[PDB]
PDB file of C-alpha atoms in Angstrom:
ATOM      1  CA  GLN A   1      27.931 -20.138  11.908  1.00 42.56           C
ATOM      2  CA  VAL A   2      25.276 -17.947   9.832  1.00 41.20           C
ATOM      3  CA  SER A   3      26.289 -15.366   7.133  1.00 37.73           C
ATOM      4  CA  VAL A   4      23.901 -12.865   6.830  1.00 37.05           C
ATOM      5  CA  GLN A   5      24.329 -10.056   4.736  1.00 38.39           C
ATOM      6  CA  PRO A   6      26.487  -7.278   5.505  1.00 38.47           C
ATOM      7  CA  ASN A   7      24.379  -4.132   5.978  1.00 34.95           C
ATOM      8  CA  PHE A   8      21.103  -5.401   5.585  1.00 39.98           C
ATOM      9  CA  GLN A   9      18.263  -3.003   4.286  1.00 39.81           C
ATOM     10  CA  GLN A  10      14.927  -4.413   5.117  1.00 40.96           C
ATOM     11  CA  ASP A  11      13.133  -1.467   3.154  1.00 39.88           C
ATOM     12  CA  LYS A  12      14.352  -3.059  -0.072  1.00 38.93           C
ATOM     13  CA  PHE A  13      13.628  -6.139   0.356  1.00 37.87           C
ATOM     14  CA  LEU A  14       9.693  -6.091   0.495  1.00 39.16           C
ATOM     15  CA  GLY A  15       7.467  -6.815  -1.829  1.00 35.12           C
ATOM     16  CA  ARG A  16       6.683  -9.614  -4.495  1.00 37.68           C
ATOM     17  CA  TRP A  17       9.795 -12.936  -4.353  1.00 38.46           C
ATOM     18  CA  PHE A  18       9.382 -15.820  -6.516  1.00 41.29           C
ATOM     19  CA  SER A  19      10.929 -18.785  -4.960  1.00 43.35           C
ATOM     20  CA  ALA A  20      13.161 -20.286  -7.366  1.00 42.61           C
ATOM     21  CA  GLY A  21      15.354 -23.338  -5.431  1.00 38.23           C
ATOM     22  CA  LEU A  22      15.053 -24.918  -2.842  1.00 36.61           C
ATOM     23  CA  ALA A  23      17.340 -27.370  -0.972  1.00 38.60           C
ATOM     24  CA  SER A  24      16.546 -29.652   2.341  1.00 39.48           C
ATOM     25  CA  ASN A  25      17.277 -31.945   4.515  1.00 40.53           C
ATOM     26  CA  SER A  26      13.550 -33.124   4.617  1.00 42.34           C
ATOM     27  CA  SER A  27      13.208 -37.017   3.433  1.00 43.81           C
ATOM     28  CA  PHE A  28       9.621 -35.948   2.714  1.00 46.40           C
ATOM     29  CA  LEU A  29      10.759 -33.054   0.394  1.00 43.53           C
ATOM     30  CA  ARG A  30      12.896 -35.076  -1.140  1.00 40.18           C
ATOM     31  CA  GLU A  31      10.385 -38.133  -2.012  1.00 38.21           C
ATOM     32  CA  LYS A  32       8.599 -35.244  -3.575  1.00 38.13           C
ATOM     33  CA  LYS A  33      10.613 -33.073  -5.110  1.00 35.85           C
ATOM     34  CA  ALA A  34       9.224 -33.523  -8.875  1.00 37.12           C
ATOM     35  CA  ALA A  35       6.143 -32.556  -7.433  1.00 38.08           C
ATOM     36  CA  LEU A  36       6.998 -29.357  -5.928  1.00 34.65           C
ATOM     37  CA  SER A  37       6.882 -25.718  -7.460  1.00 33.22           C
ATOM     38  CA  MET A  38       8.014 -21.957  -7.875  1.00 29.52           C
ATOM     39  CA  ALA A  39       5.476 -20.278  -4.912  1.00 31.22           C
ATOM     40  CA  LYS A  40       5.113 -16.519  -5.167  1.00 30.08           C
ATOM     41  CA  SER A  41       5.838 -14.771  -2.017  1.00 30.19           C
ATOM     42  CA  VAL A  42       4.884 -11.229  -0.420  1.00 29.54           C
ATOM     43  CA  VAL A  43       6.970  -9.360   2.333  1.00 30.01           C
ATOM     44  CA  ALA A  44       5.577  -6.501   4.149  1.00 29.26           C
ATOM     45  CA  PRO A  45       7.042  -4.670   7.288  1.00 28.45           C
ATOM     46  CA  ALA A  46       5.501  -6.652  10.190  1.00 28.55           C
ATOM     47  CA  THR A  47       3.841  -5.015  13.737  1.00 27.18           C
ATOM     48  CA  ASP A  48       7.017  -5.964  15.408  1.00 25.18           C
ATOM     49  CA  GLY A  49       9.832  -4.597  13.052  1.00 26.26           C
ATOM     50  CA  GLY A  50      10.147  -7.774  11.703  1.00 25.80           C
ATOM     51  CA  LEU A  51       8.850  -9.430   7.905  1.00 27.88           C
ATOM     52  CA  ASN A  52       5.521 -10.830   7.105  1.00 30.69           C
ATOM     53  CA  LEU A  53       5.970 -13.347   4.700  1.00 31.16           C
ATOM     54  CA  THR A  54       3.258 -14.297   2.542  1.00 34.30           C
ATOM     55  CA  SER A  55       3.610 -17.033  -0.044  1.00 31.48           C
ATOM     56  CA  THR A  56       1.234 -18.410  -2.343  1.00 32.99           C
ATOM     57  CA  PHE A  57       1.445 -21.595  -4.712  1.00 31.95           C
ATOM     58  CA  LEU A  58      -0.263 -24.618  -6.473  1.00 30.76           C
ATOM     59  CA  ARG A  59      -1.228 -27.750  -4.687  1.00 27.88           C
ATOM     60  CA  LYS A  60      -2.901 -30.091  -6.188  1.00 28.18           C
ATOM     61  CA  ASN A  61      -6.233 -28.317  -8.229  1.00 26.11           C
ATOM     62  CA  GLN A  62      -6.131 -25.707  -5.591  1.00 26.81           C
ATOM     63  CA  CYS A  63      -4.092 -22.641  -4.815  1.00 29.46           C
ATOM     64  CA  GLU A  64      -2.589 -22.756  -0.935  1.00 28.19           C
ATOM     65  CA  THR A  65      -1.828 -19.636   1.111  1.00 28.27           C
ATOM     66  CA  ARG A  66       0.360 -19.542   4.196  1.00 27.24           C
ATOM     67  CA  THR A  67       1.684 -16.429   6.050  1.00 26.10           C
ATOM     68  CA  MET A  68       4.355 -16.252   8.518  1.00 25.77           C
ATOM     69  CA  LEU A  69       5.743 -14.135  10.568  1.00 29.05           C
ATOM     70  CA  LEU A  70       9.438 -13.466  10.687  1.00 29.97           C
ATOM     71  CA  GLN A  71      10.561 -11.620  14.277  1.00 29.38           C
ATOM     72  CA  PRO A  72      14.046  -9.828  14.300  1.00 25.83           C
ATOM     73  CA  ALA A  73      16.454 -12.364  16.010  1.00 26.38           C
ATOM     74  CA  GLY A  74      19.322 -10.252  16.806  1.00 25.84           C
ATOM     75  CA  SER A  75      20.842  -8.040  14.000  1.00 26.81           C
ATOM     76  CA  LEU A  76      19.052  -7.070  10.625  1.00 30.02           C
ATOM     77  CA  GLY A  77      18.678 -10.246   7.911  1.00 30.79           C
ATOM     78  CA  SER A  78      18.268 -12.317  11.001  1.00 31.74           C
ATOM     79  CA  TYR A  79      14.966 -13.751  12.092  1.00 33.34           C
ATOM     80  CA  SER A  80      13.023 -16.141  13.571  1.00 32.76           C
ATOM     81  CA  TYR A  81      10.091 -18.321  12.594  1.00 31.72           C
ATOM     82  CA  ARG A  82       7.765 -19.705  15.430  1.00 26.23           C
ATOM     83  CA  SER A  83       5.112 -22.722  13.516  1.00 26.68           C
ATOM     84  CA  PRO A  84       2.112 -21.972  15.031  1.00 26.79           C
ATOM     85  CA  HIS A  85       0.355 -26.016  14.619  1.00 27.47           C
ATOM     86  CA  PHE A  86       3.899 -27.607  15.697  1.00 27.40           C
ATOM     87  CA  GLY A  87       5.733 -24.828  18.454  1.00 24.73           C
ATOM     88  CA  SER A  88       8.564 -25.647  16.547  1.00 21.55           C
ATOM     89  CA  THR A  89      11.278 -22.477  16.408  1.00 21.59           C
ATOM     90  CA  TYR A  90      13.637 -21.856  13.653  1.00 18.94           C
ATOM     91  CA  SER A  91      16.278 -19.985  12.391  1.00 18.93           C
ATOM     92  CA  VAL A  92      15.687 -17.630   9.031  1.00 18.30           C
ATOM     93  CA  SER A  93      18.200 -15.500   7.703  1.00 16.14           C
ATOM     94  CA  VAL A  94      18.887 -13.972   4.865  1.00 17.11           C
ATOM     95  CA  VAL A  95      22.101 -14.430   3.902  1.00 14.50           C
ATOM     96  CA  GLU A  96      22.801 -12.568   0.518  1.00 14.51           C
ATOM     97  CA  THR A  97      20.844  -9.827  -2.061  1.00 14.60           C
ATOM     98  CA  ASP A  98      21.000  -7.243  -4.191  1.00 17.93           C
ATOM     99  CA  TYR A  99      17.605  -6.753  -3.451  1.00 17.90           C
ATOM    100  CA  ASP A 100      16.703  -5.663  -7.182  1.00 19.03           C
ATOM    101  CA  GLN A 101      17.169  -9.425  -8.606  1.00 20.28           C
ATOM    102  CA  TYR A 102      17.788 -12.127  -6.089  1.00 21.41           C
ATOM    103  CA  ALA A 103      18.236 -13.488  -2.007  1.00 19.56           C
ATOM    104  CA  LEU A 104      19.334 -16.453  -0.674  1.00 22.68           C
ATOM    105  CA  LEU A 105      17.580 -17.465   2.518  1.00 20.50           C
ATOM    106  CA  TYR A 106      18.730 -20.350   4.835  1.00 21.23           C
ATOM    107  CA  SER A 107      16.508 -22.008   7.800  1.00 18.32           C
ATOM    108  CA  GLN A 108      17.531 -23.472  10.466  1.00 17.81           C
ATOM    109  CA  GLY A 109      15.570 -25.554  13.177  1.00 19.62           C
ATOM    110  CA  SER A 110      16.112 -24.601  16.447  1.00 20.01           C
ATOM    111  CA  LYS A 111      13.843 -26.038  19.046  1.00 17.25           C
ATOM    112  CA  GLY A 112      11.353 -28.812  18.816  1.00 14.19           C
ATOM    113  CA  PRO A 113       9.838 -31.615  16.284  1.00 15.69           C
ATOM    114  CA  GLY A 114      11.697 -29.301  13.639  1.00 14.23           C
ATOM    115  CA  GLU A 115      14.455 -29.349  15.428  1.00 14.46           C
ATOM    116  CA  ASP A 116      17.238 -30.953  12.998  1.00 11.13           C
ATOM    117  CA  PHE A 117      16.259 -29.590   9.701  1.00 12.16           C
ATOM    118  CA  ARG A 118      17.596 -27.309   7.499  1.00 13.10           C
ATOM    119  CA  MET A 119      16.653 -25.671   4.270  1.00 11.42           C
ATOM    120  CA  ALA A 120      18.181 -23.171   1.482  1.00 13.38           C
ATOM    121  CA  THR A 121      15.866 -20.825  -0.773  1.00 14.39           C
ATOM    122  CA  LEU A 122      17.077 -19.415  -3.506  1.00 15.15           C
ATOM    123  CA  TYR A 123      14.403 -15.981  -4.252  1.00 14.25           C
ATOM    124  CA  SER A 124      14.336 -14.518  -7.220  1.00 15.05           C
ATOM    125  CA  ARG A 125      12.491 -10.887  -8.546  1.00 15.50           C
ATOM    126  CA  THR A 126      11.831 -12.792 -11.911  1.00 16.20           C
ATOM    127  CA  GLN A 127      10.206 -16.213 -12.690  1.00 17.81           C
ATOM    128  CA  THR A 128      13.600 -16.813 -14.934  1.00 16.96           C
ATOM    129  CA  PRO A 129      16.815 -15.807 -13.079  1.00 15.14           C
ATOM    130  CA  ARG A 130      19.664 -15.926 -15.104  1.00 13.43           C
ATOM    131  CA  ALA A 131      22.429 -18.641 -15.057  1.00 13.65           C
ATOM    132  CA  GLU A 132      24.586 -16.967 -13.067  1.00 13.16           C
ATOM    133  CA  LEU A 133      22.148 -16.296 -10.302  1.00 12.40           C
ATOM    134  CA  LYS A 134      20.917 -19.994  -9.900  1.00 11.65           C
ATOM    135  CA  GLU A 135      24.698 -20.516 -10.081  1.00 13.12           C
ATOM    136  CA  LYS A 136      24.868 -18.203  -7.007  1.00 13.85           C
ATOM    137  CA  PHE A 137      22.116 -20.420  -5.328  1.00 17.50           C
ATOM    138  CA  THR A 138      23.572 -24.125  -6.577  1.00 20.50           C
ATOM    139  CA  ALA A 139      27.517 -22.899  -5.176  1.00 24.02           C
ATOM    140  CA  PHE A 140      25.722 -21.881  -1.694  1.00 24.84           C
ATOM    141  CA  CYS A 141      24.015 -25.653  -1.710  1.00 26.45           C
ATOM    142  CA  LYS A 142      26.782 -27.503  -1.979  1.00 25.32           C
ATOM    143  CA  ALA A 143      28.905 -25.537   0.433  1.00 27.41           C
ATOM    144  CA  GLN A 144      26.341 -26.058   3.164  1.00 27.90           C
ATOM    145  CA  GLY A 145      26.575 -29.653   2.868  1.00 27.73           C
ATOM    146  CA  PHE A 146      23.324 -30.232   0.683  1.00 28.78           C
ATOM    147  CA  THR A 147      24.022 -32.772  -1.537  1.00 26.98           C
ATOM    148  CA  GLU A 148      22.822 -32.780  -5.207  1.00 26.90           C
ATOM    149  CA  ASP A 149      20.044 -35.172  -5.105  1.00 27.21           C
ATOM    150  CA  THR A 150      18.158 -32.398  -2.748  1.00 32.16           C
ATOM    151  CA  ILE A 151      18.717 -29.264  -4.808  1.00 34.50           C
ATOM    152  CA  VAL A 152      15.978 -28.271  -7.257  1.00 36.48           C
ATOM    153  CA  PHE A 153      14.572 -25.682  -9.443  1.00 35.54           C
ATOM    154  CA  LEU A 154      11.133 -24.480  -8.718  1.00 35.95           C
ATOM    155  CA  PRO A 155       9.103 -24.824 -12.359  1.00 39.23           C
ATOM    156  CA  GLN A 156       7.456 -22.192 -13.003  1.00 38.09           C
ATOM    157  CA  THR A 157       2.978 -22.687 -12.862  1.00 39.00           C
ATOM    158  CA  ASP A 158       0.889 -20.667 -14.911  1.00 43.76           C
ATOM    159  CA  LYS A 159      -1.718 -20.184 -12.058  1.00 43.75           C
ATOM    160  CA  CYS A 160      -1.569 -19.318  -8.348  1.00 47.76           C
ATOM    161  CA  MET A 161       0.726 -16.394  -9.005  1.00 45.72           C
ATOM    162  CA  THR A 162      -1.492 -13.339  -8.860  1.00 47.90           C
ATOM    163  CA  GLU A 163      -3.005 -10.275  -8.093  1.00 47.09           C
TER     164      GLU A 163
END
């Protein structure tokens, strides 16, 4: 069902990415769509062969950090995320990437209260992705059945982007 980047090279997907686009079926996210902001995500190899994703972003008047272990899930580019707080499991796939400019990610709830969740994410190596890259994201979101009102390009913040 979910496309995973052919011949995915985990060693080339590491380092700093910015979340520049988001689309989801979460009513909660839809309702604060306007208040959502760009996050800075750092990808590093995890001790289990998968990836650690550490994201920092501005919410209210403070920088928040979140860490996510992406465990290998059967093929390179396909991962599983298990929420420590809600026991929910999600499939996370790197659908398409050129490693030095952009990545398209797709996440799907599998088990638990988050089971019906689905989300597409645009990762960019810079805070200002070219229009063509934003086209690839819009096109992916539409094809996957996300509607125009749930697709957002996350505006940059002047905070929580450092180190």
